Amino acid sequence: AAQGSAGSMLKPQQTTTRDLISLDGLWKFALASTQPWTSQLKTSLECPVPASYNDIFADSKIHDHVGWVYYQRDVIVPKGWSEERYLVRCEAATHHGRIYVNGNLVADHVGGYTPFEADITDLVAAGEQFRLTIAVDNELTYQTIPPGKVEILEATGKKVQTYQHDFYNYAGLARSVWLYSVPQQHIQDITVRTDVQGTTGLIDYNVVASTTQGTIQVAVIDEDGTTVATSSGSNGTIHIPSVHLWQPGAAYLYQLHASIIDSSKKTIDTYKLATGIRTVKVQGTQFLINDKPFYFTGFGKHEDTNIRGKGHDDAYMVHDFQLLHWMGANSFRTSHYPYAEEVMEYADRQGIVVIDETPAVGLAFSIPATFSPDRINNKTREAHAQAIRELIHRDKNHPSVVMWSIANEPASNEDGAREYFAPLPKLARQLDPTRPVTFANVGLATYKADRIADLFDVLCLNRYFGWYTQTAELDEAEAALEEELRGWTEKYDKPIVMTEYGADTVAGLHSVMVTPWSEEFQVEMLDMYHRVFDRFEAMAGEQVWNFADFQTAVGVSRVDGNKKGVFTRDRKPKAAAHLLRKRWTNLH
Amino acid sequence: AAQGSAGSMLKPQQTTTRDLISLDGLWKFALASTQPWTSQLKTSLECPVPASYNDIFADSKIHDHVGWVYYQRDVIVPKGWSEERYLVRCEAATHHGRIYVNGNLVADHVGGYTPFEADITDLVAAGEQFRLTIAVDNELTYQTIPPGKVEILEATGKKVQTYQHDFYNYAGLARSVWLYSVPQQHIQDITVRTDVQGTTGLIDYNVVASTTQGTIQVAVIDEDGTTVATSSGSNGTIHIPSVHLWQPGAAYLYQLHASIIDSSKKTIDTYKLATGIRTVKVQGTQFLINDKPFYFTGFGKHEDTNIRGKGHDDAYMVHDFQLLHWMGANSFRTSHYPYAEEVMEYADRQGIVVIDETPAVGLAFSIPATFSPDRINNKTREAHAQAIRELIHRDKNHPSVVMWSIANEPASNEDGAREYFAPLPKLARQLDPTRPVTFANVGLATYKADRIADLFDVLCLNRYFGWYTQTAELDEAEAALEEELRGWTEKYDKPIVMTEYGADTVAGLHSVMVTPWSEEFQVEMLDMYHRVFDRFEAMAGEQVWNFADFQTAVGVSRVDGNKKGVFTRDRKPKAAAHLLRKRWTNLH
Numbered sequence A, B: 001a002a003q004g005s006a007g008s009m010l011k012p013q014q015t016t017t018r019d020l021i022s023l024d025g026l027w028k029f030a031l032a033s034t035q036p037w038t039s040q041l042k043t044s045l046e047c048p049v050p051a052s053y054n055d056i057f058a059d060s061k062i063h064d065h066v067g068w069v070y071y072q073r074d075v076i077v078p079k080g081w082s083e084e085r086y087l088v089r090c091e092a093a094t095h096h097g098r099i100y101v102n103g104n105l106v107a108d109h110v111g112g113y114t115p116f117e118a119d120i121t122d123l124v125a126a127g128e129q130f131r132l133t134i135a136v137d138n139e140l141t142y143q144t145i146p147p148g149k150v151e152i153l154e155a156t157g158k159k160v161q162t163y164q165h166d167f168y169n170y171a172g173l174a175r176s177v178w179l180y181s182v183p184q185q186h187i188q189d190i191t192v193r194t195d196v197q198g199t200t201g202l203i204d205y206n207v208v209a210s211t212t213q214g215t216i217q218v219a220v221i222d223e224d225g226t227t228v229a230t231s232s233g234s235n236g237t238i239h240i241p242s243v244h245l246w247q248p249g250a251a252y253l254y255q256l257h258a259s260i261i262d263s264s265k266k267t268i269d270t271y272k273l274a275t276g277i278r279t280v281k282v283q284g285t286q287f288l289i290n291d292k293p294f295y296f297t298g299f300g301k302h303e304d305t306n307i308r309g310k311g312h313d314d315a316y317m318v319h320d321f322q323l324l325h326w327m328g329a330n331s332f333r334t335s336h337y338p339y340a341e342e343v344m345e346y347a348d349r350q351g352i353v354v355i356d357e358t359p360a361v362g363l364a365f366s367i368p369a370t371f372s373p374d375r376i377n378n379k380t381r382e383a384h385a386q387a388i389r390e391l392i393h394r395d396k397n398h399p400s401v402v403m404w405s406i407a408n409e410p411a412s413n414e415d416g417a418r419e420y421f422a423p424l425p426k427l428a429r430q431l432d433p434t435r436p437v438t439f440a441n442v443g444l445a446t447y448k449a450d451r452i453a454d455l456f457d458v459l460c461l462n463r464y465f466g467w468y469t470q471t472a473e474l475d476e477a478e479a480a481l482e483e484e485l486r487g488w489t490e491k492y493d494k495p496i497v498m499t500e501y502g503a504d505t506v507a508g509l510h511s512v513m514v515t516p517w518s519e520e521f522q523v524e525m526l527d528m529y530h531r532v533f534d535r536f537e538a539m540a541g542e543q544v545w546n547f548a549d550f551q552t553a554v555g556v557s558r559v560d561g562n563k564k565g566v567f568t569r570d571r572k573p574k575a576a577a578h579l580l581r582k583r584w585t586n587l588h
Helices: A060-064 A314-327 A341-350 A378-395 A417-421 A423-431 A474-491 A519-533 A575-586 B060-064 B314-327 B341-350 B378-395 B417-421 B423-431 B474-491 B519-533 B575-586
Strands: A020-022 A026-031 A046-048 A068-076 A084-090 A096-101 A104-109 A116-119 A129-137 A148-152 A159-163 A177-183 A187-197 A200-209 A215-221 A227-232 A235-240 A254-261 A267-275 A280-282 A287-289 A296-300 A331-333 A353-357 A401-408 A437-441 A459-462 A496-500 A539-544 B020-022 B026-031 B046-048 B068-076 B084-090 B096-101 B104-109 B116-119 B129-137 B148-152 B159-163 B177-183 B187-197 B200-209 B215-221 B227-232 B235-240 B254-261 B267-275 B280-282 B287-289 B296-300 B331-333 B353-357 B401-408 B437-441 B459-462 B496-500 B539-544
Touching (some): A200 A215, A200 A254, A215 A235, A314 A341, A401 A423, A519 A575, B084 B096, B104 B116, B187 B254, B227 B235, B296 B496, B331 B539, B423 B437, B474 B496, B519 B575
Parallel strands (some): A296 A331, A331 A353, A496 A539, B296 B331, B331 B353, B401 B437, B496 B539
Antiparallel strands (some): A084 A116, A148 A159, A187 A200, A200 A235, A215 A227, B020 B177, B068 B129, B084 B116, B084 B177, B187 B200, B200 B235, B215 B227, B215 B254, B280 B287
16 A cells, blocks of 8 residues: 555456455454454454444444454365465455454555455465454544544543544445455456547557466457457557447446466456446536536435445345436435445446545535644645545446546635645546546535635535525525526536535425425425526536435434435435436436 | 204304303313212313313323213303393204203203204393303214214223224314303394396395394395395395305305394394305206306315314314315315314305215214114114204305215115115205205215115215225226226216225325335325326316324224325325325316
């Protein structure tokens, strides 16, 4: 883990040449008390892996814990492995993960939403058994990339985790853990850039191999199963005659088979990696996927379900996606962190557009000046960029991912904000020149007051007039909102997307009168917002906040988390769901 | 209280000539234990009058009580009263009411929904104070007009009230009590029959005076305040040039001022009684109010609110009516009993159409043969007719009331049913030849199976396929329902009204899938029913069941009463409300 760079490999898969093993299951679990990774574990406490631990146990001490926790289990390297290089991966640690093989530290990793792994091949032998213990610290600071500070309670002395975001600070191994193998000479990375000449579809590729052994073949197969182009070399471009384009309601995916042939006509490594072929351009006030203009519809979302909290779930993913299709949503935004990788591949097959967001949420203090040597400084920017790299490295390939979101609701109206943010969108366009760049702008940072927006390609606005400013005054709110829309459309020649608009709603709370927290009120606000968007020709999309009720930090104005959900936390449609379905399916 | 007749007076009002006093307030209250009406009352227990007692006290014994209860309070006759005849009235007793002046029985009355009164003028003196005690028995039997049987619990021996209806058996003084005065020679009744010659509006009247003193004047005033016709005599007809007609969305009411002038040009009694002028004809498959065809929209309703249960409430009435206008409902049906009189006058001013129903609900046993010498016999029919009389006597005048409903869901497919019912619609047409006659038919009594319908003018159907028969099978239910609609339209040349269709819904229970008890399911059933009605040209109206969740007898398939409400018991709109508003306001 180095400054200015990203060292993950490709998403482990199984092949004729590589082997894959799941470490998911229950693991022994305990709380920081000393040096637990040097002996076995002493607990009847077992925690499921793909999951956040906080809610799992029905224990207050555990849920409330500030610091490190310890997952542990034994592992056996299959005896079939020697002559194969093998290693241990975490798709994500809560925030700060550490990997111990038997009681030597083998990896330390600061991102909370991106993979990390350790090559253990010289460290254990094929056929041998070791003690995998993984340490996850949930502590946020001013330098950690969702920012925060631990404090202490004057009377009881209890440790307490402050932060500036909405959603609860769920910790642990939220994403699958793996033990896999790769041949000594292997493909480590692949870069795919899809473009279109007339009707001919060309993808520039780039394959990275552990050594300089043999050569690099690439077959490119269609959905039916018949290869449609081939190539040699670590890099080039591939021509596809009469391409089936990946379309935002009509996913087409070709399968790029990268192989590492040895001296002779023999395959020694291979890797299957799906791409779809699509361009993304912003021209002025317009968002083009495949040179036709596009309008987002959908939600910012969360990784949040009932007991597992943030832990990725196969069936909620599929269900969630069906609800999107049910209502004719075409996109969503990975809200305030990168989601599980498997959600991105699913999004690709599913033909859903994604706004991929770094875990930079709450870069402000006004939910004290936020950009200084105290709160958000240069060491913080360093971590912010560190996170931009790992996200892009990981996600660069998904045709569904369509624009990077640098941050949520940063204090972009304050002195200091511009210096801070300047290198970040520039980093993004550099590492990946194919997609546009944005961040979701807060209400305070008005068109006048914001000093960041010009550095970005698309304008993403979060607004809540009918909620905060004009509380229940929908007409006075329609005033405020078009005031603001005008301001942006006049000052800038970018396209605009409402990334956040909504109102807390308690399922079953009804009222014939104007009343916030009533299914009815939610409808009305949503509806008048829509009416306003349609009168602005500069709008390029709309994302309700949020998909579904979700858990947040304890708070008096938070009714057991955030209820701005259009669906309940158990995924049941409020009235708003049906409004959105009616608008999204019945017009363009 | 005599067989073949009805002895209530006109609804007491205040005038230049009559005086009115409310007895409402808290009264001392106690349960049958002996002969409590002969001394004062011994309880800290006070019960509000306009109200049903069962829910009021938070006491199980009281709520559960089977038998008589005793309301009591002192009353003072104003000293201004002598030379005026005065008396004591109950707008309604729970079911069986008794009035004691000081400990002599002065009235005994078997209806549960119609007024009764006692002339106390020779019994107390103006200026004197007496002990008004009123006894209300809540016991139903096979002869009482909502039928039932008290049973006993083998183990505990507890008394327990069985009955065949849905709604809870709320007992007590549900409607206001009064002490009023009337001159010695006074108007006791008035009969108004409104008709139309071309554009000239003629109302036949009939005034009944206690004695043969003086003569009878009648002024007929418009809404502005200017008398537009006059007349003399106990009876005649009045001609109104270019009448403003009472219309089903446009209430016009003239004020008929009946006066009893004495030997000389002096008024000795007077009474203000509003009428509106409208005809009601059924021609074949068509329902005509003022010779233009009419389609009902609305609900069967209940007199049921939170703590008072059945007790009439001013503000819920007005609110309830506003909800009707809010959603473009034009009618409702007094569900399974006559409602408070003041609701009928309000309905008149409000321009809402009413189906006025007797308290004959549950005339069946299949919710054992119901028409015999055991269950529903001739003594029962006698009470049924006794109730038809008092309803008509009371309600004959309201332009809003538009059709009589003889019974709810009687066992009209069974042998015995025809003999039983034969004299009842005939009685109704006789006592009041101006309105049509009906009853609401049960699902069992199919077009084939029912042996009553031909005796009635309008066909009123209660159906619940998408609920009972085709449970959640909306398509298989659309089959069943049009099967049935065809049958009736073919066999008979009457118009049809769906008096009941609905599905229990728990506020806030949502589902993207087909699931009963979910706000969504309610919408869907309601919607497909509508689609079916529109394809039948014989339909003359639609009344959802029900307006609002309401309390019923304890039962496992009754989630704290009946949830077939479109609004909650606290009057909050479920999704169905908005569907109905959308259908009723956007088309004819």
